[PDB]
Copies of this chain bind each other. A is one copy, B any other.
Amino acid sequence: VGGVWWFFTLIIISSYTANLAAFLTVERMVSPIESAEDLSKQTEIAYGTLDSGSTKEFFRRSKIAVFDKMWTYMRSAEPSVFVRTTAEGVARVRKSKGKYAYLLESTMNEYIEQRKPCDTMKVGGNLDSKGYGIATPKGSSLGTPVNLAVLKLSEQGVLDKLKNKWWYDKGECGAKDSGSKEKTSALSLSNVAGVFY
């Protein structure tokens, strides 16, 4: 009985002290809301939209019930959830401290998160897709040379290289490219405080 309980102890204890200093310094990320289903199960945080926007006109034209709730939330919400520019919607999220959400396009939400102060986060998948296009008036002569020119950039990867250049060369937050690199530190008493309790 003792001889096996010894060998039981040798495996369990040595597996407990394997990576023990890591688990006292996990540094978890909470991420309270993701994945727009769980926007609708935790709807108490205040959503936000752009005035005169496609994000407005998408949710004005709501058909899916998860999408219909979040607009019928915002239209009767107090106060006016709309902001006049992107710099108004970004700043309203930053002040409210996890309490005000703003629904916005994927590339600006890519851009704001990269730029310091970098206190915001892009969670959840895209809820659709939509495109920016160079536009001419209907019947314009320039429409045909431009329409051929868009692919002709894109097949060469010129547009992708220009997309690689601009969205990466701007202000980068530290946890975007080289924030993956790790390091070690001494144990703090706030890490081991329950054992003294």
Contact = CB atoms under 8 A, between A and B. Distances in A.
Nearest to A65: B165
Copies in the complex: 5
B184 A19 contact: yes
A36 to B, nearest CB: 13
Interface in A91-112: none
A47 to B, nearest CB: 16
A24 interface: yes
Contact of A156 (B63, B169, B195): B63
Contacts of A128: 154, 157, 160
A7 interface: yes
B18 A24 contact: yes
Contacts of A84: none
| Among all A-B residue pairs, the 7 with the closest Cβ atoms | A22-B184, A18-B24, A14-B17, A11-B195, A18-B21, A8-B195, A63-B156
Interface in A127-168: 128-130, 154-158, 160-161, 165
Contacts of A20: 14-15, 18
16 contacts: A8-B196, A11-B194, A12-B192, A14-B17, A18-B20, A18-B24, A19-B21, A19-B25, A19-B187, A22-B184, A43-B171, A61-B155, A61-B156, A128-B154, A129-B154, A130-B155
